[PDB]
Design an enzyme around this catalytic site. Structure first.
Site, PDB file in Angstrom:
ATOM      1  N   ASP A 110       0.871  -1.159   0.000  1.00 28.28           N
ATOM      2  CA  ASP A 110       0.000   0.000   0.000  1.00 28.28           C
ATOM      3  C   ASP A 110       0.903   1.202   0.000  1.00 28.28           C
ATOM      4  O   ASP A 110       1.906   1.223   0.711  1.00 28.28           O
ATOM      5  CB  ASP A 110      -0.888   0.005   1.239  1.00 28.28           C
ATOM      6  CG  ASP A 110      -1.843   1.178   1.257  1.00 28.28           C
ATOM      7  OD1 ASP A 110      -2.707   1.264   0.361  1.00 28.28           O
ATOM      8  OD2 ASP A 110      -1.724   2.024   2.168  1.00 28.28           O
ATOM      9  N   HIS A 154      -2.385  -1.912   4.691  1.00 32.91           N
ATOM     10  CA  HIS A 154      -3.065  -0.625   4.806  1.00 32.91           C
ATOM     11  C   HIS A 154      -2.899  -0.047   6.210  1.00 32.91           C
ATOM     12  O   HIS A 154      -2.524   1.116   6.377  1.00 32.91           O
ATOM     13  CB  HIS A 154      -4.555  -0.792   4.487  1.00 32.91           C
ATOM     14  CG  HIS A 154      -5.373   0.426   4.791  1.00 32.91           C
ATOM     15  ND1 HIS A 154      -5.405   1.529   3.965  1.00 32.91           N
ATOM     16  CD2 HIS A 154      -6.126   0.747   5.871  1.00 32.91           C
ATOM     17  CE1 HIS A 154      -6.135   2.475   4.525  1.00 32.91           C
ATOM     18  NE2 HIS A 154      -6.584   2.027   5.683  1.00 32.91           N
ATOM     19  N   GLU A 205       5.495  14.293 -10.272  1.00 35.59           N
ATOM     20  CA  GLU A 205       4.260  14.073  -9.521  1.00 35.59           C
ATOM     21  C   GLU A 205       3.753  12.640  -9.691  1.00 35.59           C
ATOM     22  O   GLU A 205       2.710  12.403 -10.305  1.00 35.59           O
ATOM     23  CB  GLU A 205       3.182  15.067  -9.968  1.00 35.59           C
ATOM     24  CG  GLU A 205       3.413  16.499  -9.494  1.00 35.59           C
ATOM     25  CD  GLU A 205       3.370  16.630  -7.980  1.00 35.59           C
ATOM     26  OE1 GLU A 205       2.325  16.302  -7.380  1.00 35.59           O
ATOM     27  OE2 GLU A 205       4.379  17.062  -7.386  1.00 35.59           O
ATOM     28  N   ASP A 253      -4.037  -2.493  -1.869  1.00 38.56           N
ATOM     29  CA  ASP A 253      -5.327  -1.942  -1.497  1.00 38.56           C
ATOM     30  C   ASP A 253      -5.907  -1.162  -2.675  1.00 38.56           C
ATOM     31  O   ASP A 253      -5.740   0.048  -2.789  1.00 38.56           O
ATOM     32  CB  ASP A 253      -5.183  -1.027  -0.288  1.00 38.56           C
ATOM     33  CG  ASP A 253      -6.511  -0.556   0.234  1.00 38.56           C
ATOM     34  OD1 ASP A 253      -7.502  -0.641  -0.519  1.00 38.56           O
ATOM     35  OD2 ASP A 253      -6.570  -0.088   1.392  1.00 38.56           O
TER      36      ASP A 253
HETATM   37 MN   LIG Z   1      -5.020   1.821   1.876  1.00 34.76          MN
END
Ligand SMILES: [Mn+2]
Length: 713
Positions: free
Chosen positions: A501, A688, A539, A571
């Site tokens: 993640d 996460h 970016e 995720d």
């Molecule tokens: Mn996440």
């Protein structure tokens, strides 16, 4: 075990909605232009749009000739139809008003819950289906400024404690535009300016611009009042989609997406499967158009064998091996159950004493306090196959006294355990802060609130917590200590299952771009690592660097991935860039990477509360478990676009029954977390959670992380 037919929130669309001719073009905005012309953006970069109407555009552009509906990639066919449905009065605006005819806005305190429908189009086989999903926004009826009691030294607190999901709606503007408050990057300090000139310009901007009439102005002042120059200007950016706008807490109201997140509100945003079914039928019947079917589509699902329910087992000191799914003379004692682990981190072999802390919220009645302390005392004894601190955990003075008292007994110590009993009043931030502050002192903690303490007692001993609950507390603490307290009768056809993640956060000599959590083929969590990266050039994070650092970091932790097969999951959707990074890492280390999208935020809903899974639109929807206590509708986990990457090469795959089974088992590894809501295979879930912990200033004990300690959970 067996098949079944359930109703889903889709409604077949009539082929007759497909346009005769389609016009392509090469180059307010590109997306507006398309929408304006009843069309869509085929290519974002080369500004290529597909229109069902002769493209009107008073600027430059090159007609790329007509195209047929059969030539658009599915996605575009679906986007184009969605856009066409609107032209027939079937859009989110229209049907949301219909929904509110049956499910009306309800206000709770200073907050109003507003129901609406989120709509998309899924192409299943050779047909298109309109997905209508009921959702809720939670808007404050009071203005931000009014909320914080016109206190600046209270407004910043607000932007901080609610930074993650807070949004602001400019109720002072006709377009009710929503915004996202800006923060001192890598900090929870919000971007503010007490500069009275800024506050005056923009406050005066609203009037001269949208209310330039004697009565429009009078209402404005009646509504908002004269400018409060003591208020700071909030720097923020558009919520849609670089720019940056100024907002005045005097003219904005906090707003939230309910699904994205009180108590009386939840009982109102949570809907049973039949309530959702009914409400869509109410909407459909009110829809005076035959461009779509009049009833919800049904689909054939595959129920999930109750056998896969018992592959995760625990055991006691004797020879009792019962699976996770839970008279004798001894049942009279308050002793906790006995769980003899299959593996205990080697870190515990040296450690001397382990300080134990009973942290009691001074705001809990005495009995609740004694109940809790007596329960913790028993919980710790089993832990082994003491200081009592009492403070107002609901005040910044107490949490500090608590931490202060703990650090006092923790100097010189490697590990400590804290058992906290607190009211339910405590905000999430306060719980998070107590747990983070305490971990800074090498103290792993387990919180138990008043709710569980009062309503989860044992029928045969009201002075003892529920036996179901007792086992789950034991599992949580044990899991925070990297203890393999269970065994999984299953084997993953992978060397390692890795959940990652991305969540860039700068830290003391760090700059961390994300996280990775590693599970082995036996289904045990073995390593948790931060992914340090360089200062972002363009970016966009350099996934190649990201994933390489992943390989390198794991080596640091005693795990080489080269010449290994892994199931890497993240995720959400797997972005092209992340793919490259995976091809990159594939070749450089000869790693065989099997990956796919693992989406938890989609609108597809099956109106049945049972473990199942089905194919829809080329993706697979899975319900890991049924809601057993709490009210609501299950949220499927969406799996899609699977692929295998060998030698820097991507080869699209198809999700097999075995794939779905792997996700299922991985999802059931919730580590005794009471109230099962884990809508993500443990690897991605914990991935996460850690990314969050890092973004929240949690200490990164590499020693614990190397043994799988889920201390940040
Ligand atoms: Mn996440």
């Amino acid at each position: 075990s067996m098949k079944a037919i359930v109703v889903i929130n889709l409604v077949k669309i009539n082929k007759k909605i497909i346009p005769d001719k389609i016009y392509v073009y090469r180059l307010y905005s590109i997306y507006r232009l398309a929408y304006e012309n009843v069309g869509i953006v085929i290519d974002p970069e080369n500004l290529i749009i597909a229109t069902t109407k002769e493209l009107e555009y008073e600027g430059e552009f090159i007609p790329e000739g007509e195209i047929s509906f059969s030539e658009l990639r599915n996605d575009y066919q679906s986007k184009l139809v969605l856009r066409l449905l609107k032209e027939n009065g079937i859009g989110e605006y229209e049907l949301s008003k219909l929904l509110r005819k049956f499910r009306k806005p309800k206000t709770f305190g200073d907050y109003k819950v507003i129901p609406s429908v989120e709509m998309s189009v899924i192409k299943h086989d050779e047909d298109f289906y309109l997905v209508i999903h009921i959702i809720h926004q939670i808007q404050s009826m009071k203005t931000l400024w009014e909320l914080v009691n016109k206190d600046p030294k209270e407004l910043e607190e607000f932007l901080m404690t609610h930074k993650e999901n807070l949004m602001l709606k400019d109720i002072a503007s006709p377009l009710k535009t929503v915004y996202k408050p800006c923060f001192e990057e890598y900090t929870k300090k919000p971007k503010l300016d007490h500069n009275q000139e800024i506050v005056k310009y923009w406050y005066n901007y609203h009037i001269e611009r949208y209310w330039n009439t004697p009565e429009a102005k009078l209402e404005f002042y009646r509504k908002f009042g004269q400018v409060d120059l003591k208020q700071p200007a909030i720097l923020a950016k558009f919520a849609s989609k670089n720019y940056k706008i100024y907002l005045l807490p005097q003219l904005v109201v906090p707003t939230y997406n309910a699904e994205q997140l009180a108590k009386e509100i939840l009982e109102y945003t949570k809907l049973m499967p039949e309530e959702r079914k009914e409400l869509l039928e109410n909407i459909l019947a009110e829809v005076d158009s035959d461009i779509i079917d009049k009833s919800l589509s049904e689909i054939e699902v595959e129920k999930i064998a109750q056998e896969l329910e018992n592959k995760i087992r625990v055991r006691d000191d004797k020879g009792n091996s019962v699976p996770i799914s839970q008279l004798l003379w001894t049942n009279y004692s308050r002793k906790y159950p006995v769980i003899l682990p299959y593996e205990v981190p080697e870190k515990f072999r040296k450690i001397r004493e382990i300080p134990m802390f009973i942290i009691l919220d001074s705001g809990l009645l005495a009995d609740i306090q004694n109940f809790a302390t007596n329960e913790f005392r028993e919980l710790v004894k089993s832990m082994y196959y003491e200081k009592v601190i009492t403070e107002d955990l609901n005040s910044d003075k107490g949490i500090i006294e608590v931490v202060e008292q703990v650090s006092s007994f923790m100097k010189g110590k490697e590990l400590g355990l804290a058992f906290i009993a607190a009211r339910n009043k405590l905000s999430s931030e306060k719980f998070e802060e107590i747990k983070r502050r305490l971990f800074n002192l090498n103290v792993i903690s387990q919180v138990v609130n008043e709710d569980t303490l009062k309503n989860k007692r044992d029928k045969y001993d009201r002075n003892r917590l529920d036996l179901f609950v007792r086992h789950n507390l034991l599992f949580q603490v044990l899991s925070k200590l990297g203890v393999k307290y269970y065994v999984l009768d299953y084997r993953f056809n992978y060397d390692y299952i890795i959940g990652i993640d991305v969540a860039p956060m700068k830290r003391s000599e760090g700059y961390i771009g994300g996280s990775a959590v590693m599970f082995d083929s036996q289904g045990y969590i073995r390593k948790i690592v931060p992914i340090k990266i360089g200062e972002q050039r363009g970016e966009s994070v350099d996934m190649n660097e990201f994933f390489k650092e992943m390989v390198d970091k794991f080596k640091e932790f005693n795990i080489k991935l080269d010449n290994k097969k892994i199931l890497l999951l993240r995720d959400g959707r797997i972005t092209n860039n992340e793919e490259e990074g995976l091809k990159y890492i594939s070749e450089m280390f000869d790693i065989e990477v099997v990956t796919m999208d693992v989406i938890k935020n989609h609108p597809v809903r099956a109106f049945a509360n049972m473990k199942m899974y089905f194919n829809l639109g080329g993706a697979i929807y899975l319900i890991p478990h049924k809601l057993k206590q709490a009210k609501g509708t299950p949220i499927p986990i969406k799996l899609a676009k699977k692929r295998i990457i060998k030698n820097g090469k991507v080869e699209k795959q198809s999700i097999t029954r075995q794939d779905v089974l792997d996700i299922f088992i991985l999802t059931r590894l919730n580590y005794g977390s009471i109230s099962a809501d884990m809508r993500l295979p443990a690897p991605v879930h914990y991935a996460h959670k850690f990314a969050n912990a890092i973004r929240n200033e949690w200490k990164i004990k590499e020693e614990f992380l190397a043994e799988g300690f889920l201390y940040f959970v």
